[PDB]
Amino acid sequence: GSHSMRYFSTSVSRPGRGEPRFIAVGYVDDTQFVRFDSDAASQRMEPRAPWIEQEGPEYWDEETGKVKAHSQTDRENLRIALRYYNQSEAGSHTLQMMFGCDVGSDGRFLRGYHQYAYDGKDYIALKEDLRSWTAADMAAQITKRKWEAAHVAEQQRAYLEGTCVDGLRRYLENGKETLQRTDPPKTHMTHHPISDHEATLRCWALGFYPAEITLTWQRDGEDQTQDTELVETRPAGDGTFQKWAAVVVPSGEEQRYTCHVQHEGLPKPLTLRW
Amino acid sequence: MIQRTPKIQVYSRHPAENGKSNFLNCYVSGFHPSDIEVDLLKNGERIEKVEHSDLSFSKDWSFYLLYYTEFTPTEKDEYACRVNHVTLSQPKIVKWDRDM
Amino acid sequence: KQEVTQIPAALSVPEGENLVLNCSFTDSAIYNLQWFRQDPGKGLTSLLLIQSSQREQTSGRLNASLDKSSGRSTLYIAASQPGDSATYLCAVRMDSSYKLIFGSGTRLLVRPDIQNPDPAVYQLRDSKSSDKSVCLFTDFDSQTNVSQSKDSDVYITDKCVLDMRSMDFKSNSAVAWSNKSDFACANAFNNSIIPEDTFFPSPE
Amino acid sequence: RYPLTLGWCF
Amino acid sequence: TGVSQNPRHKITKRGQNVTFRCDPISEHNRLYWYRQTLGQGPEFLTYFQNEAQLEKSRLLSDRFSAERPKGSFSTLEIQRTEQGDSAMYLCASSSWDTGELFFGEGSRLTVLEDLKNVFPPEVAVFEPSEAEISHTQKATLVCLATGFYPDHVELSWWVNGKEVHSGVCTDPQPLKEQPALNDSRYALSSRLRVSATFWQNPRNHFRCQVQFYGLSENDEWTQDRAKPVTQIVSAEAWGRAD
Description:
The complex is a heteropentamer.
Chain A: E1 3-12, E2 21-28, E3 31-37, E4 46-47, H1 57-84, E5 94-103, E6 109-118, E7 121-126, E8 133-135, H2 138-149, H3 152-161, H4 163-174, H5 176-179, E9 186-193, E10 198-208, E11 214-219, E12 222-223, E13 229-230, E14 234-235, E15 241-250, E16 257-262, E17 270-272
Antiparallel strand pairs in A: 1-2, 1-5, 2-3, 3-4, 5-6, 6-7, 7-8, 9-10, 10-15, 11-12, 11-16, 13-15, 14-15, 16-17
Helix pairs in contact in A: 3-4
Chain C: E1 4-5, E2 10-14, E3 19-25, E4 30-38, E5 44-51, E6 56-59, E7 62-67, E8 72-77, E9 86-94, E10 100-102, E11 106-111, E12 120-126, E13 133-138, E14 155-156, E15 160-164, E16 169-177, H1 185-188
Parallel strand pairs in C: 2-11
Antiparallel strand pairs in C: 1-3, 3-8, 4-5, 4-9, 6-7, 7-8, 9-10, 9-11, 12-13, 13-16, 14-16, 15-16
Chain D: no helix or strand
PDB class: immune system
Assembly: pentameric
Organism of A: Homo sapiens
């Protein structure tokens, strides 16, 4: 299947209390592989998945240098944003960035991303064509005109289609035993009477990877959306994910309900019935 | 200035079995700003040895974090998460249910 | 790991030739490349920058190409002029850091086209203290090479090109001198092959 | 593999 | 406009400390230090983004240290200089977008065992020969700067109080007067060529001016011969009617 590499960075100013805190994390698909935290003692990009520990000392030197440069860049950008928005040096602000690339099953470039948010809102984003910018407000329009005149997008595109894709291909191969593995969900049902005329059926999916999954309850084969209690897919903490869906049913009618489980790691969808 | 309140789930890594070591999780997501305190509680008292995942965020820019600790569930011990965030007048306390 | 190579490392060419200067690098994962020129004793002048997403860049008589996967860049100097004589340096920035990594450079000499050569050896006298003098060998065409003296008490500088711009006239010269009795302009350049028709002014 | 930040100035 | 470095030239005795300064292009966020010896490409020392020193090489050994305390200007200090430190120290800054490096004119360092061998040039101007004038209707003046050490000179021609460039050629490098001697002194030659009629105007005044970079007025000097300080040495000639 197709794969993604993503980096997510967060800078948060804290005026009077030193320079902004910068945290960056890198992912391949749903698996984190590196981190950097400007407040941490090491001052190094650090490994967060076993397969990236294969990389030698030059890699860590290189990545540390590059992520620290980003830290400084986003320090600069926080200062500029203050000016663009006419905001005081008193308050704390947040600058986020996401970038990375998608590749198909043969390893070919699919899509690129390069985007910013200021204080939780869209600021500026590279369009899918990787040639054009979307400015979300008047301040970001200043940045957009600056970047258009300087043809900044061309070297951003080069990274997304080049360096990004080559890194992802390398990571996918080095970590193929875990990254290209599929762990299908282990499923079960629970059943709890809540009164003498109603009972809860809860359908569980556990230990699955990747995170994408669909859990659906059907009654007589019909829609149960409004009546389904569904939690957001959540990390187990060991590299896998969990989810459940629950319906309240009339006692004695359990056999009328089916829970449908769809996941990439299943040969065919599962149908569960109490 | 955006403010978004955290969604909170408290749950175990594996289905609970009394007397068997496990991990207790609190997953907080969908929040902004990123400053947050998340404590795990055993019988109402704060657990000291709690770690968390590195700060990250979703497509919509809202943050998420997993906090976790090793624990051995028993029949009568009660567990909860306590979440302290600028969007909440008081911390939100959510009790652990073994089937949720 | 990255090695930037510039071969040939020295060139001597006739003025007007359309030139190619070579750069190669062992690691293809470069972000951009920059060409510079440097005159002896001086700093670096930036000439062209080529981004990894560009195949070529142009500025006046200069073009540069880039072929990342082949690990090559070429600097083209159209209609080369004596004033182009300098050391040309290639440098690359890696995808993995911000510094430039430099080649050692190619030294370029562009010889002037001497349309009407007048080779001659003159004696010139000190403005303050004659009887002190030097010997000037001048106006020879760029096919002439000035050798070092057989005598270690005789100093001979290499050929220098001057340009009298508003007369549209260029000339080569070498200077020889010696605080020594047997040294005469007639014999100053005897260790060189000078043109048969070199003018030696009559004895005073 | 991290990018360079040339061109990222607001 | 350009990147500015000071001092342009620096001569010192072995064991002395030295400090160079760089003032980058204003809007440039990155600053780089390089070291260069004759015939070689510049070698990387260190670079800054704003005030942060983000990469240094092994050539930035313990005696070498740089800072850029406010962003803006940077300082490179070398402790206990050794003769092996002698080199051109180059500073550059780069643009926010392309990262094109723009270099200063460099700070050229010469470290000596002692200062006893330092000498300013003697300068002589040699006048155009009558035979050149007869043969070509042109007139070449020659300047010789001789006996100087070390090899830090800048030679320029001045005609009637203004510096000239047209018709000038100066040797690219000085030559050694005694190539077999370890601390050989140097010589340098230049030509200025003008039309015969220009030389023949006795109104015309020609000056070969040689800036020598030597000792600071403050350097320790215990020899009876005059302290060989940084100075200008010139020779002059007047046109001749005949």
